[PDB]
Design a protein around this ligand. Structure first.
Ligand SMILES: COC(=O)c1ccc(CCNc2nc3cc4nc(N)[nH]c(=O)c4cc3[nH]2)cc1
Ligand SMILES: COC(=O)c1ccc(CCNc2nc3cc4nc(N)[nH]c(=O)c4cc3[nH]2)cc1
Ligand SMILES: [Zn+2]
Ligand SMILES: [Zn+2]
Lengths: 369, 369
């Protein structure tokens, strides 16, 4: 019923748990968003994505504007109807993918021109594409500063992102239907530099957003450095709005980020690694292709509540993946996404119950044994 | 409850409809068996295969004996438990696939030695592999005569198959658990030659089987010739047992074969063509990759009752297949197998109601319009 309402139900240290209520559904936080870049969470029907526990999925302005096209998706009824997912969708703004995937780019104050075949992205165009898609959470159009960067290059990059954040805010607010039905998140930049992170947080808070992402991380800096930056960066963001760490991550990354005040996550790891034969378990990842699993009748994980672990053995899935069978990718992906959702549920419950510190400790001791 | 009981409920001309009762379930006839060569019906969970209406699926002695291995599958609890399909499974005997897929073969009265890596198949070994798999319908080990063949080569080939049929019968009967719980089908050979087909039918009937397959067809002869051979060959088989046409086929092939007395079918077409972008419809096949479907909001088929057609558009599936997305293969395959099952249901109902001739006419007029 509400457009966007974030409520924090419980806290432990910097960790929080609660809910975001939106018109298309409730998002339990901390939340993990399966990635659906090509208007599909790879190898899963939307009903299966929901069955694993996902409340919201992620889509991408960059990919969808190229294929099948934003105007086309709008003509077909919007992204939700198109792919058959009726719950909230967050869309990245294109700011990162344009620089990561394009064959040629030209950057300027206006935006980014690129070859996929020539196209343009700008704060205004990004917001309009996300409107055409019918995104529930719209990301500001930003620049993900390369890593490493000199302080001066990080500063000029972050400042451009802040000017683009204001343009994103204005474009979103100009579109009445979008402003009434969707939410807009700003993206903090500043590389690894505390003063720049502060300047970025200040600029975003002055503009005002429904939520705040920590951008510019998970770009090769490694966990120690990422955690160091989160240590000072997250407290700079408004406490009363959600905090979204873009592109993170491995299970231990998620746990440590929640310890540092992050509420939302997305990553291709569970889907991509699932297809590649890696299954997540409470005792750490396993590669199901390994010969040691060829006659193993146990499920992928001994505690996992997912449909895959209720029905099929490691031995069968091993056979499927080694044979290159589509069902192998399906089962591995469903299990991995379910594992990620169970991780988030355990995080939420432990924070609610004031035992998250103990959970994090127990989780790590077992996962890395 | 019974091991194997075939009942014919209704007839129209040469067409029949009825049921095969087996310990693991009832098979409604005429029946279409989805193919699950690598211990999976490609891109479908077993529950989805069942949801489309399938009563029985097909597996393959040749593929499974190589990967993951027959003794291995038995150690893991049998094929049913391994893949999660608890209903009847028919297994081909290896007789056809060994000659179709092997890199090198040596044929003799004993059987066939082949390179996948050196292995052997014989009537006794084939029956034992099918026992280890836990097949419900076991096929005799035969030789699918190449096409075309001289009458003399067809004759010597068919005669060897008949000697192998008796050895198959004896091997099956020697295994008490198999003889008590499974059924054994013989395979008629004789190429396109009426006298040889008759000699083959006579030999098989003298031995006695639970069902009779028409082998040696769908080998490049084309529909006209296949129908010509079926015209005289099917009446040679015992009327009171099921008639199984191996490897057939396209929807019109199935309809014409039922008109000629066939009760059971298997084919990779719906699964394989589904993955390749071909969808079956009552107005004929379509290729969903075609640009004409890019903004088509209609389901794959306007009448189809399957879950895919209830939820997703041609436009979305077009996008998925062009993007190489696994969900594209999943949805196309589910629809195609569901279409095949709906075809079989319409065939069964029309025979039951004494209007199958009219159905065949109406079907063709529309399918080929
Ligand atoms: C050498 O590179 C690497 O090691 C490496 C490590 C992790 C990822 C996972 C993805 N991480 C990630 N996704 C991201 C997406 C983003 N989107 C926007 N709009 N702005 C950002 O600031 C941003 C940062 C990201 N970081 C990708 C690359
Ligand atoms: C040039 O070749 C072609 O045109 C062509 C046409 C259709 C198929 C589909 C498959 N047809 C088929 N599968 C078959 C499987 C069989 N198994 C046994 N044990 N004995 C047979 O006698 C037999 C015949 C078959 N015929 C395969 C090949
Ligand atoms: Zn699981
Ligand atoms: Zn359908």
């Amino acid at each position: 019923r509400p457009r966007f309402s974030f409520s924090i139900a419980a806290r432990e240290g910097k960790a929080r748990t609660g809910t975001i209520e939106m018109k298309r559904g409730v998002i339990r936080t901390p939340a993990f968003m399966p990635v659906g870049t090509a208007a599909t969470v790879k190898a899963l029907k939307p009903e299966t994505v929901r069955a694993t526990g996902a409340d919201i999925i992620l889509g991408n302005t960059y990919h969808l504007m190229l294929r099948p096209g934003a105007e086309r998706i709008a003509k077909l009824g919007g992204l939700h109807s198109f792919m058959g997912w009726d719950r909230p969708i967050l869309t990245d703004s294109g700011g990162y993918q344009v620089m990561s995937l394009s064959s040629l780019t030209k950057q300027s104050e206006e935006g980014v021109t690129f070859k996929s075949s020539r196209h343009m992205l700008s704060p205004e165009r990004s917001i309009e594409i996300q409107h055409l898609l019918g995104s529930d959470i719209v990301m500001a159009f930003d620049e993900c500063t390369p890593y490493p960067a000199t302080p001066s290059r990080a500063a000029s990059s972050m400042e451009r992102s802040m000017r683009w954040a204001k343009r994103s805010r204005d474009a979103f607010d100009s579109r009445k239907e979008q402003a009434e039905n969707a939410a807009l998140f700003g993206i903090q930049q500043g590389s690894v530099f505390e003063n720049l992170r502060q300047q970025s947080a200040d600029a975003l808070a002055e503009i005002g957003f429904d939520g705040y992402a920590v951008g510019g991380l998970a770009v090769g800096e490694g966990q120690d450095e990422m955690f160091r930056v989160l240590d000072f960066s997250v407290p700079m963001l408004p406490d009363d709005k959600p905090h979204y760490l873009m592109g993170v991550g491995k299970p231990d990354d998620i746990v440590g980020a929640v310890e540092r005040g992050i509420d939302m996550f997305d990553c291709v790891l569970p889907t991509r690694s699932g297809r590649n034969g890696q299954a997540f378990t409470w005792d750490g990842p396993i590669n199901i292709r390994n010969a040691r699993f060829s006659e193993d009748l146990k499920p992928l994980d001994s505690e996992c509540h997912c449909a895959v672990c209720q029905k099929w053995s490691r031995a069968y899935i091993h056979h499927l993946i080694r044979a290159g069978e589509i069902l192998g990718a399906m089962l591995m992906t469903e299990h991995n996404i379910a594992f990620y959702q169970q991780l988030m549920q355990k995080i939420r419950d432990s924070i609610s119950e004031g035992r998250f510190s103990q959970f994090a400790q127990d989780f790590r001791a077992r996962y890395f044994a």
